[PDB]
Symmetry: C3
Subunit: 213 residues, 3 copies
Amino acid sequence: MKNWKTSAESILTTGPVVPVIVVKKLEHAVPMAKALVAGGVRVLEVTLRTECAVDAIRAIAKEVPEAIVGAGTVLNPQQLAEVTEAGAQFAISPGLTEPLLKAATEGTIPLIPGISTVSELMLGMDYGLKEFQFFPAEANGGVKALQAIAGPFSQVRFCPKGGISPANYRDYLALKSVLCIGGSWLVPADALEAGDYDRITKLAREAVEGAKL
Amino acid sequence: MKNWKTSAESILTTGPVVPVIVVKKLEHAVPMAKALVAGGVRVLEVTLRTECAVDAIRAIAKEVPEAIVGAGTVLNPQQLAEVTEAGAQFAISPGLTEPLLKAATEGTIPLIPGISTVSELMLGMDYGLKEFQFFPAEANGGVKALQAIAGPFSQVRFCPKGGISPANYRDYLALKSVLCIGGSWLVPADALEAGDYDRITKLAREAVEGAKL
Amino acid sequence: MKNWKTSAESILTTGPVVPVIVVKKLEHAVPMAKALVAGGVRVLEVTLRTECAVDAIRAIAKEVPEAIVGAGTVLNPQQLAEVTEAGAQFAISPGLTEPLLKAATEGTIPLIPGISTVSELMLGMDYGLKEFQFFPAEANGGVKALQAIAGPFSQVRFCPKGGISPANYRDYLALKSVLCIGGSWLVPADALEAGDYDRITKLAREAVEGAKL
């Protein structure tokens, strides 16, 4: 997009795993982001599912500048403008809509919207997008489904998310159309609340390592 | 909606089961609605799949005022206006479209549209809807798929329909996002053909009973 | 459509099988189209997946009067206008979008767009379409899924495509809503190189024959 400083592609090629974080206790946002970076993971998706989500993005955005923090669960222009003002570097949505796609493309940060069908993908392509999230990965039919959908579009790249785990993520990563995946196991809600940051750094390290081949 | 007397939520919380009725002979509409009410089921979805569907709705509307009669298979604004004039108290559609979503929200009765993807759900939410039908439930990937889709939306409630039976409906009912399900087995075409209204009342009773827990 | 000379229905009732052709070398377009016609197959879908796809359509369109050549993989109005100018008699898309449906319906050739959900089908019906492609057939849940989706729409007809083979195509053809299927096995990428057009004609013959009942 003529309006995006950083491309959606760069966001997804930074690493094989994008942690989908849920922050309960704002106080744990920064130490958490640092634990992940120490583990090799710098692209963080902070989902708008808690009251402090936006503040978490703003905090991380300024105290851990080495991290590329973004917003998750962006459902409409209002939230897009909100996380953009808070310092998010990218936004991810479980699905797409014209209003959201129109705000995104006129906005200043890349949006990587999720799709389940070829039509939704084509709608997204109508606005010039090439990077999408495949959601809910598993529910949509996993790897075989994605291969069927991706088939006709060589230039399109995806970030599968939904029911993906250490047990299956290499299966998605092995696809040509897949740049990375969305994993929510790098930050257990328990370890977060418990301030157990070493657990988090270990998970990230292993995630990254287990991605090779 | 500022234009809806009764909410879509009330329609779905009335009972765990919503029978999806197909009427081929107008003469059986009233005696059928009464059989279901006698069995504990008062929310009836009369699908626009037969020539007498609308007349069936109008008849039930006055012959059985204890029943909340609605229309099913509403595909466009024309049919919405039609069943609304005939006395339908609610409308259900296998899918959604902006023309239909706009029409419904300006209209006077609640529309509970079906969705299969997050994008379709988000389009529906753009018009303020919170109650949707999950169709075709099974074909879309059943309970696991619905859980994936529902996940990001705590305030949204569904009414799964499509391939649901006595054998699996408690699985859907057990979900927090599910208020009720669409069942088409309460009115066996035959039973009706053989005017076994007692068969119908028995099925309804059992359906309701088998829903507890 | 008031603007379409030939209907989308005629395109699909011409034969039980519509070959989805991939042409890499323009020199094989005409001899190939003739091989298929000799085998009984006259409706050809030349997919826009190679540089010479459009030239192949133009060549066949003028060289082989006994066939009905169309374009496949049409993703937007630009390509629709392009294949229309090249002589395509119909266009097929893996999905649908309002820009494409609007351009198509204002255009002069029938578009048979693919769908996976009821909503996408309803969007297509909003523009007056009745013939659709079911894609990706298998990935969407095959015959059971299609039956679920087709159910509420008696007037709608489909052309399943995606994972369909000589092993399952009669299963789809057996459905009342199905007029024909998209098969990509009538033209082996190999048969083209060695220039074994007889192999192609044999496959077409067998395809047609194996469709009876």
